Design a protein around this nucleic acid. Structure first.
Ligand SMILES: Nc1ncnc2c1ncn2[C@@H]1O[C@H](COP(=O)(O)OP(=O)(O)OP(=O)(O)O)[C@@H](O)[C@H]1O
Ligand SMILES: [Mg+2]
Length: 120
DNA sequence: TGACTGGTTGGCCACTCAATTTGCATCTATATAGATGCGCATCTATAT
């Protein structure tokens, strides 16, 4: 009946535009055009991760039949005590590059090489 | 006639994690010797 779907809208997650989200998207675009690194800080329930999701979605990948894709924005949440091989594995996986095994020095070189040409 | 011979169905390196030692900084809750102040005795002086 009608009552059963309604848990799902409620339980279901959604994104609501808010002033705080808009503020970040414009600031990040300044940083992205300028190629300036920066940090975002704030308390854990302010919804930082969600604003960053909403930002990622506004810039879809472009894919041709043969050559590899353009992807402007990469988002990763490291695991606790994330080491070098674990960081390179996450950058590599968010792009779905097929190679999965390697020495730390091999993943380092391979990560630099997939950020290049892919146009991040 | 009793001999001879032939017959024949894991290793070499690079990286990571639980641990467990050692050292340092920060309470903390008690233990312990010195000022300070009444509370009365004791002496001295003064007056009728
Ligand atoms: N723009 C938004 N629209 C709708 N809901 C939002 C928005 N921003 C945050 N929320 C709500 O915040 C909750 C999740 O918080 P979120 O994970 O965004 O916080 P956070 O600050 O990124 O957390 P942390 O820093 O601890 O990782 C959800 O209930 C989600 O609906
Ligand atoms: Mg977050």
């Amino acid at each position: 009946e009608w009552l059963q779907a309604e848990i799902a809208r409620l339980k279901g997650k959604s994104i609501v535009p808010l002033q705080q989200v808009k503020t970040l998207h414009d600031w990040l675009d300044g940083k992205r055009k300028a190629r300036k690194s920066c940090r975002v800080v704030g308390e854990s329930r302010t919804g930082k991760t969600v604003a960053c999701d909403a930002y990622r979605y506004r810039h879809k990948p472009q894919q041709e039949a043969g050559r590899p894709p353009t992807v402007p924005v990469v988002y990763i949440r490291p695991h606790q005590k994330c080491g070098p091989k674990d960081l390179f594995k996450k950058i590599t996986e968010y792009l779905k590059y097929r190679v999965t095994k390697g020495t730390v020095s091999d993943f380092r070189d391979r990560t630099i090489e997939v950020l290049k040409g892919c146009g991040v």
